[PDB]
Structure 1
């Protein structure tokens, strides 16, 4: 009886004569049920794709082709299931379903005996069953002829627990694959796509109006991936083209924007209702109820992940097919199915998302509940909801509904956008880009203007042209912005690339690529902002033309940028444009040029530009720029000449003897006016250091000198003390972080610090100074004729033997206000000894660093007593120490005291039990000005990191 069934299935499935053929794409499907590896032969194939492509037509073509030939020959039986046309709440058996599918019931009994090896199941649409499962526990059915709800039967089929060693083909959607991939055993995935990008582009191009705005609107539509990617379905592209043609014919009476999917959908829907109206008028009361019911049903279906809307669901909202059909006269809520029960689905999921988003606008217009008798899936609804805030649409809604329309959700959207701007440790660029894309959908100045008012700092990654356009559109309304950073890794790497998308050019005469003009528009937007004064290029790679455009736009008179940074960008090509820009933008006074190698001509041009009267750069950082002898000669000539330069950095590049003597000759002259000099990680030797200090002996202009990470001898320290001894030295801050200073050099330093003014800071980190030299240092600091204000001993070798000396110094000192003890093994006895003199608050110490000091839970009582009555202390560090629960509780209780005035506390709060976290939260609640962050070194009241930038 197989021939009768084959003839019946041939008669049933015949709707595509010019669409079904032996295409080159179909032999892949036929061959897929073959072993790719000799060991492996798959048994399950999953066809996923966008909603609008022809997956169901493809499955029907498979079933029809098996019934004739050339498609499947080993498969003795093929059964087609359409689950969106049936109800999955009744209790039945697998035999009944097949009997409904197969008119002859006597074939199955002989079928089951030998067929399971050679048999094929085709299931169409198991996308609506993602909600039927309770997700708690499902009982697996093992044999057929079992009276169970059919969803359990499908669950058992998918798990190869009902009819094993059989082949399955499942047609589903991309977003309905989250719960199914765990159920099925090693499937094979086939990705289905619609029409190509060139065909899509041509189809869009024919329909655009071409009245003087064709190019910009065309490019706005085509580059938008959210619209362009989902336009794969022929129905969606047909809708877009029909909307575009309608707008041109409805020229002046249509004011809705045409750059976004929301504007095109509103055009079709709202105009469709107008044709019904004999005259321009409002909706009747009954029709309003129908529209609200449709919107509410769509929204509930979106929330509950349902897309079938059975008959009882329609009666819940008091809907009727006749009313909807006679209200729109358009293809909405198509009816599918063949049995007694009926199912109603939207023509496309985009329409359901549009109506779900529209529900939020009309929910508060009245009391609608009287007449009713009752994260990827939410992207489209969210985009439509953001888009529907355009004021032109709300005017049409007000015309239809007779009342002013002001939705409540607008404030919620604005508040969500505002929450992104104010973050404690910087803003995430991805959320910024998502907010920018969402706000670009509503072509409204008031909404977008009011949403962006609290940013003050933006970090942006750009890797598409649409990113450039949306950022250019949104950044115009950021009137409070003060600092920006852009990362463009690969968009502008290659200088020349000339290609056209179609066979013929989109426009007859372009004369310039699209990328360059959008880049120029972005650069002009940057150059027009008023309050912005810091530009960082991040990790950008730029060619010659791009850098030329950037420089020409920055040359404008409306650009007030003061800081320019290139420490991580490759801009070697556009250095000529940079030099020409240098002396024409007179608001620029800080140039960072790290890591970019400098040649002879580049250095010559840079020095010539800096000598210009029109240059106002005052800080020049030039680290890791490999220099030559002639470069050092030209640097010396620049220093001796007329310049406005005050800070110069030459870190991380070796300096020779001849270059050193030339630089010293430049510095010793009375015509050099340089304030700060940074010379760390250079090639300094004790002889070179001796020569440098000997040359500097006659200088009276340098006030900041950094000599970290070098090698300094005892004679060098003696020469430094000799230079500090004479009057009119005007040296304020000295840094010697890794230079090795040992023995007598500490004694010279103490002799100098015993009676010396004008020296307020001194850093001695990472130096082998023990308790013996600390005796001399504390004795020197005890005298009233010592004006030192800050001392750093982070990694010096210290023990608890000097803690009594430190406590006495703290009690007696009247000028020191900062003391750092970073990696010293003080222990608990030393800390108690120090706290003995700390608790009396005899001095004005305001910053204490006790990190990594090896503190257990024995000194916690003394610490709490010291910090309980100590109003002068303001900052404290306690990281990298071991505290028990009781000690932490004592510390928290000391924190809560009304006498302490601690403002910054360095603790990682994610290392303690729940009780300590609760106490910390209560401490933060009582005192609202306390910051508890582990990054203790990121707080600078005064300029402390002047040599690290």
Structure 2
């Protein structure tokens, strides 16, 4: 083998570490038998020579860290990737947390012996390097790609930006990465990961569990007794799959055997298993200690764990132990009872999960007399940080805290420990959850998955109901059967839901078609759907990228079609199939309260459109607003859609944005609208890829429709002939058009005079949005003169990003002080100088101005103009300056957002 001293140093160091870090020294043969499949998969996936990045997937406690340590140790002895990988660097979140500002070169050199190859020399061939990011969920900073990404390793940079660049492969694209994340980590980082590869850890099996039990128990008879005892219990045996939970069960059984009491264990939930483990180890490890001193020791350990969790520190220096109140004898006591262990020259908890367990246990010792710790947050802060999706770093703690809220669990804790515990934790949690429920959902971005997990783990149906009924808008993603059962347990007895957003995949039968699972799955789905019909406030239902089958969707339609339900808005994204279409037709036919449909993103064909139009032809339909944005509808399919407008007189809003009609759908719609019988009032055709050829036909609509009022034809190549034809059509007062949206129509200022005519002649046009068009100072001048003409009944005018000039300001200055009916003007992205800004501000200050809303970006100006704008805002409380005034409103009206 090639001579290498970094490899030898890593081999020695992690060979030493492998015999102390794990809870028990598992035999090497048995361990490699347990995880042989994943080892082979990794060996096959890294023998292929941007290298793809593979991430280990699984819940906490399966052994991802141990697996990574074993793999890289085997590499260190050279039995793996001998001719593939030359240098492998192990990076853990806990050791990088203490780093404030340091370059990657120094980070790699901190453990790289000097008497070796230079770092630049080893980096000259970055195709042979592997960066194993282990336990990145223990980091103090979350990953959101907000920060800038760097490409140079030599230059000092912060840890967050370096990690982001390495993850996104903009820094050393040819390097290989090995990751280990949980389910929540995958959910948070799915967007960030590219070329992602998935490897799943399976844990222990039947024979593996038996062998591990026999290895843990050096004896035979009681070992077989314990194995049988865990065998008769289905839930305990299922939870025994995780090696850490298996070790917890083994040590709890050992404590029970050494105590002499009969084998008893509460295995309803994982948290119950943790509580039993802690109770029995505490009872077995303290027998000659007074209960006052026992309580003091437990409180000191709990405060230490809570401080470690809140400060994101997992290596405890003896100074920290002295500060928190831990003595040498107490340290020896916990080392003997196997709750802490040496990680070199410092101490660390036996496992991170036990660490947040003790951190949550700390909150049971609340003392009103004691002042706030100023470092550890209160219950409300912990709940907010755990249930919110921004950080989601102390979720597990909250979970344990939730289990501590139940009367039975706290009674068991008080009985076992012997000293009373705080009983206001449940009330405080309820108040905090109510407070966050009262907050607007947009500014909080609450992660309902963590809250639902806590509610499922607490097993308090009345408390679950009280918590769930606080929230009105529920967003949920269901990708696993465990997620499905958790959601069913949370929403079985919900009767306050009003807005539901569901992203549900990979759950209903696609593999393993056994008789069991699936029938129960359907029952779970029926229990979930029961919330739709059990609450008389259900308004909006949004199925985003959902994957249904025939029986599940049939059950959902049966639930929604009941007359007791009052669903109003149905937003179905990326879901339209033959069975899906038929079931949606059943929903539309049987529901009289349904009025708003948004099929944005759902790909449709000619047959699908024909079936939908045939269903809409039914006279029982009470549908009013219909949006089919980005449905890939062509002109011929519009032939069916037009037929709907022939019969459906209740419909009054139609949006067909982001289509490819190419004047054919426009011609068909105009021909349908020729009949003076349609009650359509709003039509949106943005980005329909249609030209001015059909615009003349649209002209014939404006002279024949007395009901159509709102027309949006934006983001279409209309040039000047189209807009001139539209103006000629709108010259006649007989037109009933009220609002016109012609942004990004690619017209110039020469045709603006025609617009300058219609603003004088049209007495019914209230809103005109001509933004994002190259109309220069000249066209601005004719528009301003048209407003100056004192017969213009125009209210809203949007000329954003029109490439205006400061010379136009004077023309604007006269307009705002002359047009009395002008209320809102959006003139964003205008270049202003001192002279133009001064006259504009004077015009705004002048009392003759009737403007109420001004769309302009104040931040994009120099100090003088910004100061003048602030002054004019101060002197005019009745005028509001804003940016992005109509973007969200336009998106909502077109259905792009929802």
Give the TM-score, by structure 1 length.
0.61
- CA 1:450–1:743 in structure 2 vs 1: closer, same or farther (change >3 Å)? closer
Matched residues, number: 706
The whole-number CA distance in structure 2 between the counterparts of 1:415 and 1:229 is: 35
- Measured against aligned partners, the alpha-carbon deviations of 1:492-545 in whole angstroms (never above 9, x if no partner) come to 5x8531267xxxxxxxx6283665554444344455444332222334455555
Q: Tell me, yes or no, if the aligned pair for 1:664 and 1:696 is still in contact at 8 Å.
A: no
8 Å contact kept, 2:488–2:525 = no
Match of 1:123 in 2: none
Tell me the secondary structure at the aligned position of residue 834 of structure 1: helix
What is the SS of the residue equivalent to 1:472? helix
Of 256, 260, 271, the match for 1:262: 271
Q: Residues 801-835 of structure 1, C-alpha deviation per residue, up to 9 Å, x if partnerless? A: 23222212222221111112123333221111212
Q: 1:486 aligned to 2:490?
A: no
* SS at 2:807 equivalent: helix
Q: Which residue of 2 aligns with 1:54?
A: 24
The 1:261/1:52 distance shift into structure 2, 3 A limit, reads farther
User: What does residue 736 of structure 1 align with?
Assistant: 742
Q: Deviations over 1:728-785 (max 9, x none)?
A: 5322101111234456643333233224322110111233433333333223323443
Equivalent residue, structure 1, for 2:401: 385
Change (3 A) 1:777 1:317: closer
Q: 1:742 to 1:362 in 2, by over 3 A?
A: closer
Per mean C-alpha deviation after superposition, the further-off stretch among 823-832 and 471-480 is 471-480
Please name the residue that 1:361 is paired with.
Answer: 364
- Report how far residue 643 of structure 1 moved: 4.3
Do residues 697 (structure 1) and 700 (structure 2) align? no
Alpha-carbon contact 2:702-2:737 (below 8 Å) kept: no
Contact 1:718 1:748 survives alignment (8 Å): yes
Residue number in structure 2 paired with 1:333: 337
Contact 1:788 1:815 survives alignment (8 Å) = yes
- Tell me what 1:442 maps to: 458
**What residue in structure 1 maps to residue 619 of structure 2?**
613
For the residue of structure 2 that corresponds to 1:583, the secondary structure is helix
For residues 870-901 of structure 1, give each alpha carbon's deviation from its aligned partner in whole angstroms, at most 9, with x where no partner exists.
Answer: 2321x214xxxxxxxxxxxxxxxxxxxxxxxx
Q: 2:580 aligns with which of 561, 566, 574?
A: 574
Larger CA deviation: 673-682 vs 43-52: 43-52
Instruction: Name structure 2 gaps, 5 residues minimum.
Output: 33-93, 101-109, 116-133, 141-158, 160-176, 181-200, 214-225, 309-313, 342-346, 371-390
> What SS does structure 2 have at the residue aligned with 1:426?
helix
Q: Secondary structure at the match of 1:774?
A: helix
Deviation at 1:387, TM superposition (A): 1.5
Q: CA shift at 1:615, angstroms?
A: 2.0
CA contact (8 A) 1:484 1:534 kept: yes
Go from structure 1 to structure 2 and tell me whether the alpha carbon gap of 1:236 and 1:365 turns closer, same or farther (over 3 Å shift).
Answer: farther
1:196 aligned onto 2:210: no
Which one of the candidate residues 24, 42, 50 is aligned to 2:8? 42
Q: Which residue of 2 aligns with 1:292?
A: 295
- Written as runs of structure 1 = structure 2, the 5 A alignment for 1:699-714 is 699-712=705-718
Counterpart secondary structure, 1:299? helix
Cα contact 1:175–1:376 (8 A) shared by 2: no
Native 8 Å contact 2:291 2:418 kept in 1: no
Q: 1:564 to 1:287 in 2, by over 3 A?
A: same
Alignment partners' CA distance in 1, 2:790 and 2:4 = 90
CA distance in 2, matches of 1:291, 1:617: 69
Query: Please, what is the CA RMSD of the aligned residues?
Result: 5.8
Q: Displacement, 1:588? A: 2.0
From 232, 241, 249, the equivalent of 1:236 is: 249
Q: 1:589 to 1:463 in 2, by over 3 A?
A: same
1:790 and 2:815 are equivalent in the alignment:
no
Any conservation in 1 of the 2:699–2:726 contact (CA below 8 Å)? yes
Distance 1:239 1:545, change over 3 A: farther
Judged with a 3 Å threshold, the aligned counterparts in structure 2 of structure 1 residues 472 and 692 are, in CA distance, closer, same or farther, namely: same
Q: How does 1:96-135 map to 2 (within 5 A)?
A: none
Moved more, 44-53 or 380-389: 44-53
Task: Indicate conservation of the 8 Å contact 1:357/1:381, yes or no.
Answer: yes
Change (3 A) 1:526 1:54: farther
Please give the alpha-carbon distance, in whole angstroms, between the structure 1 residues aligned to 2:550 and 2:861: 57
Matched residue, 2:448? 432
Q: Distance in 2 between matches of 1:723 and 1:551?
A: 46
Secondary structure of the 2:442 match is coil
CA distance in 1 between counterparts of 2:739 and 2:834 reads: 33
**In structure 1, which of residues 664, 674, 692 is the aligned counterpart of residue 670 of structure 2?**
664
Verify the 8 A CA contact 2:766 2:794 in the aligned structure 1: yes
Alignment of 1:94-243 (within 5 A): 196-199=204-207, 222=238, 229-231=242-244, 233-234=246-247, 236-237=249-250, 239=252
Partner Cα distance (1:189, 1:664) in 2: 59
Distance 1:629 1:293, change over 3 A: closer
Matched, 1:686 2:700: no
Q: Which one is further off, 855-864 or 388-397?
A: 855-864
Q: Would you say the 8 A contact 1:782–1:809 is kept in 2?
A: yes
Quickly say closer, same or farther: Cα 1:267–1:243, change in 2 above 3 A.
farther
Q: Are the counterparts in 2 of residues 839 and 865 from structure 1 also a CA contact under 8 Å?
A: no
CA distance in 2, matches of 1:813, 1:134: 63
Change over 3 Å in CA distance of 1:263–1:797 after alignment to 2: closer
Q: Is the aligned partner of 1:597 residue 2:603?
A: yes
In structure 2, C-alpha distance between the alignment counterparts of 1:249 and 1:552, rounded to whole Å: 51
Task: Please say if residues 499 and 540 of structure 2, whose CA atoms lie closer than 8 Å, have aligned partners that are also in contact.
Answer: yes
Going from structure 1 to structure 2, the CA distance change for 1:656 and 1:595 (only over 3 Å counts) comes to same
Is this contact kept in 2: 1:297–1:317, CA < 8 A? yes
The Cα shift of 1:472 comes to 3.0
**Structure-2 change in CA distance of 1:799 and 1:649 (3 Å):** same
CA contact (8 A) 2:281 2:337 kept: no
Q: How does 1:838-877 map onto structure 2 within 5 Å?
A: 838-851=844-857, 855-860=861-866, 862-873=868-879, 875-877=880-882
Q: Is 1:473 equivalent to 2:489 in the alignment?
A: yes
Larger mean Cα displacement after TM superposition, 418-427 or 639-648: 418-427
2:647 to 621, 641, 652: 641
Per-residue deviation, 1:237: 5.0
Deviation for aligned residue 1:395: 3.7
**Highest Rg: 1 or 2?**
1
Deviation per CA, 1:126-182: give whole Å up to 9, x if none: xxxx99x9999xxxxxxxxxxxxxxxxxxxx998699xxxxxxxxxx9899999x9x
CA distance change for structure 1 residues 735 and 473 in 2, over 3 Å: closer, same or farther?
A: same
Which residue, out of 820, 824, 829, partners 1:818? 824
Shift in Å, 1:697: 1.8
Equivalents in 1 of 2:245, 2:712: separation in Å?
63
Deviations 1:270-292 (A, max 9, x none): 799999xxxxxxxx999642542
Task: Confirm or deny: 8 A CA contact 1:775 1:802 kept in the other structure.
Answer: yes
Distance 2:317 2:862 in 1: 66
Q: CA deviation at 1:669?
A: 0.8
Q: What is the DSSP-based 3-state SS (H/G/I as helix, E as strand, rest coil) of the residue aligned with 1:876?
A: strand
- Distance in 1 (alpha carbons) for counterparts of 2:554 and 2:408: 41
Aligned mates of 1:542, 1:472 — CA distance in 2: 17
Residues 1:39 and 1:614: Cα distance change in structure 2 (over 3 Å): farther
Report if aligned partners of 1:53, 1:194 keep a CA contact under 8 Å in 2: no
**CA-to-aligned-CA distance 1:550-597 (integer Å, 9 cap, x gap):** 434433445433222233456565222222222123332111123333
